[PDB]
Amino acid sequence: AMKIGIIGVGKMASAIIKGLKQTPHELIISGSSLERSKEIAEQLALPYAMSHQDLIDQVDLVILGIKPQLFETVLKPLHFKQPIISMAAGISLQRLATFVGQDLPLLRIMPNMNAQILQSSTALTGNALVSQELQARVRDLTDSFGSTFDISEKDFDTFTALAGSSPAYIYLFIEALAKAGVKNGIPKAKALEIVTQTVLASASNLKTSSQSPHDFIDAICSPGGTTIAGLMELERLGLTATVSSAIDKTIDKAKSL
Amino acid sequence: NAMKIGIIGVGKMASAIIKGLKQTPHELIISGSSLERSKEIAEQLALPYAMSHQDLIDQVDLVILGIKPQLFETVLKPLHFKQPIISMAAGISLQRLATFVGQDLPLLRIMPNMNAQILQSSTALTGNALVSQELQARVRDLTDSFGSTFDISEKDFDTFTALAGSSPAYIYLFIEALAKAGVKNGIPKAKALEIVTQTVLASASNLKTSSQSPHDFIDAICSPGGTTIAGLMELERLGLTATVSSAIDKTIDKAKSL
Amino acid sequence: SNAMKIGIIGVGKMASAIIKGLKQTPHELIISGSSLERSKEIAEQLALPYAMSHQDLIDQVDLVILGIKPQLFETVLKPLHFKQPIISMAAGISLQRLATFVGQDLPLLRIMPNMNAQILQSSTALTGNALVSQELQARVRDLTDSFGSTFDISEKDFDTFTALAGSSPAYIYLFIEALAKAGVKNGIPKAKALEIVTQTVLASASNLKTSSQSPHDFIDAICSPGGTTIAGLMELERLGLTATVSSAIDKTIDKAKSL
Amino acid sequence: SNAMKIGIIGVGKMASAIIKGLKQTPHELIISGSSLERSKEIAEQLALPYAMSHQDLIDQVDLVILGIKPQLFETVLKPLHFKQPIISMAAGISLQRLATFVGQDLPLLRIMPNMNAQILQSSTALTGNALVSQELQARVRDLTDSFGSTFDISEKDFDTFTALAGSSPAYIYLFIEALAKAGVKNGIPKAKALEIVTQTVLASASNLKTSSQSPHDFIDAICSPGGTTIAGLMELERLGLTATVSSAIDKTIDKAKSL
């Protein structure tokens, strides 16, 4: 039952703590100021530390919940002495070692906001210093707020797009369907209820089936019907290309960070 | 209080609601396009068949129509109905149905979707002037057997057809597009599909139980100077929302024309 | 005998293409061109008898096949007096309309063949009016089976079939030519580029035909992750290949409807 | 005997597809997966011997075929010690690069097959380095001829061939699926729409193959003036079918180049 410290606590880091609370481990947090630390510690019902170093001094494992562009500034004056888990997009384990040390085991995760309901899809990977013992204990941590995917580091930026960023794309999609409902006479809340329930069921039906999404499309598209009319419209306007180009842009950005 | 329910025409959609119907106390019987088809689907479904549509009509408390909208006029006019009828067909009004079957029948429309297969359809229900408070409740019990039921007015049925009946296909094309982007970028199709399907399911579930709007979540996920806002502005640039909305418009136009 | 006499009024490219198949049947054939001069000319090319006029043809024949274009039906048919079942191959003209030109007392049939009739591999739709008996339709199916395969298609689906089977060979050729031209752009001689793609098209279609896998199933198989195929496929998506084809089929069908 | 022992390192979809053809040869086959577990698993599926490791495979075999993806060549090959001619099927990796991974003392060959190897109708390019004798190339051609046809293609043309023959089946499938989907839109069941178009695609390509006419010659033949085909063809032009295909081939080739 180790002691875990979280440096930087924004929305992603907060979403993860709910799940970490259901582990046997003891937790402590450290924010961007002492006042911010207290604020967040209050709403999570967890202790906080007097500084990042004070956190580092008492803790067996550190989780970094700060944004990637703050890594160099925030991390360089600190002296780490335990394994570190980064959740940051774009920053390689090699680059992290440059900031914190060549003598530490380092892990990356890529969770998403679904950690809020303990249903994150989280990628996990570690550097050469990560024993199978340590990787296992971290996997136990990630499994506490959803599922875990053994993902080689070269695939992290893609996974960031497919799983970390995609909930927002999924929400834009649902929102577009609901807005189309409003355009055509159905109240927003009601359209959103219908659409969300349909998304949920469709995804569950796919999960438990051996059929492909394209097999399902075939079943739903009655000849001369309404679905095939709308599907050909989605083809005309480039639905697939649009999603793919957005994914590419997500990945480009991850790379340049 | 147990009915005999007869199904005329059994396509993919009619087959999909059968599972739910089988969990009801009611007795069921079917009739396809020929006698040969009738026995093939009786075999497939472990349900008794009638010798004809009229034979079915003559012995049944309630009729569900599973035939395609384009076949209504041809198949229904020769027949003599003697009980409440449920149509699941896109784009055919109860008024228009009444001209096919009689002005003396209680008539209901439903709009289900393929998720009836897992008993998780989102189904619209409405009835004509001749449906009692009590009959619509009896039918709501039917539709609840294969998912959820929405009491929506008939003027809204074409929009509901797009939002719930057709949209699983649009959802699947979206899922497939995310997964193909994974393949393009070096992730095996099976794996890519597992990740995104799980993310879609969790995202929808979080939305449902949260008080936050879709746009509220987008704000939370879009870290300043991050990856999500980059991809989000690309979706804006290429017209994700306009594209979806135009597709729904086309779906509705088609329903109107049917 | 089982042999009947078959007369063909108007012989363009499509009518010529089915002749070869009709020659492999037990039947006697005779033709009639747009003029007596045209008739002799093409009777020579095909090695077949000609008639002195359409009505002369009609007076001796057991079955008429019309090879004239849809636009000429009214002009050419109305003056004639028909006495036997007629087969039309024209796009966009219903059996109901044909009967108004030709008579309400005749068995009438529609076919929709394609240029692959040339090598006896047409994909041909077949339908008949209420006057066509089972025996007659089977006799006509035997005719259509002589230059390809035959599909029992409802008349309401004829315009769509026209697009999918009658017009699509041209669309398939354009697509094949596009791939070969892309080979030329990138350093491969036209002839060699056409040999490679045509062979790949043939093999791919046979594979599809004998498999239980869908086209999309095959696409998943071929698209190695991070590979060359998925890159080309996403470019097809970006530029709207599927939308383009579907829009072209809609225009084909709109045309069939307005004819 | 004339029988040699052939070992396959890495067996994905493409390597599996050529196995069937290799079984119809007189040679002895052995495989090696990405792990000992994977090896046993797939040796069962194919009914073939497996090796305990890639090097174990190498030590007993007369010829190695590589079925691993281009991205893994460096990682997987460098630790191994090869002792025999090697055939690579990987897109975008030159014989020069392969020799830097594997040795300057080996005969090395490249092939570019496609998934039609499944029905023994691959369109397969073949080339060899300076170390490959006439006897060896002929022996390898015999191997490739077992699962399709074989083209003698210069290495400088391999990326283009990859697009025209290796990746294009997926593009052909998308095009076929587009036509069938257009049939669904317009009232024809998917299965039936796919049967009609696939048959038309097959027949059209055979017609082209055995004819002296160009694709464009055929297009002229099919496009009846004021007809349905020319309407659909001008819509193909408007929406840029040819440009789309060619652009997709360029992206395929760019990808091959960057691999």
Ligand code: PRO
């Ligand atoms: O909701 C419906 O009516 C359609 C019919 C086929 C698939 N679902």
Ligand code: PRO
């Ligand atoms: O495509 C159609 O026409 C039916 C009705 C909605 C879902 N499937």
Ligand code: PRO
């Ligand atoms: O996975 C992450 O790191 C991002 C941060 C905000 C939403 N989820």
Ligand code: PRO
């Ligand atoms: O937008 C970003 O940068 C973080 C990482 C994925 C989702 N939220």
Ligand code: PRO
């Ligand atoms: O030629 C090749 O190598 C590819 C691999 C998957 C499908 N065919």
Ligand code: PRO
């Ligand atoms: O997509 C790829 O990379 C492999 C090589 C050509 C066909 N399949």
Ligand code: PRO
């Ligand atoms: O089916 C037809 O009628 C057309 C005429 C020229 C080419 N094939």
Ligand code: PRO
């Ligand atoms: O283009 C046309 O009108 C004829 C009919 C289909 C093929 N050729």
Ligand code: NA
């Ligand atoms: Na980066």
Ligand code: NA
């Ligand atoms: Na309507």
Ligand code: NA
């Ligand atoms: Na017409």
Ligand code: NA
């Ligand atoms: Na390359």
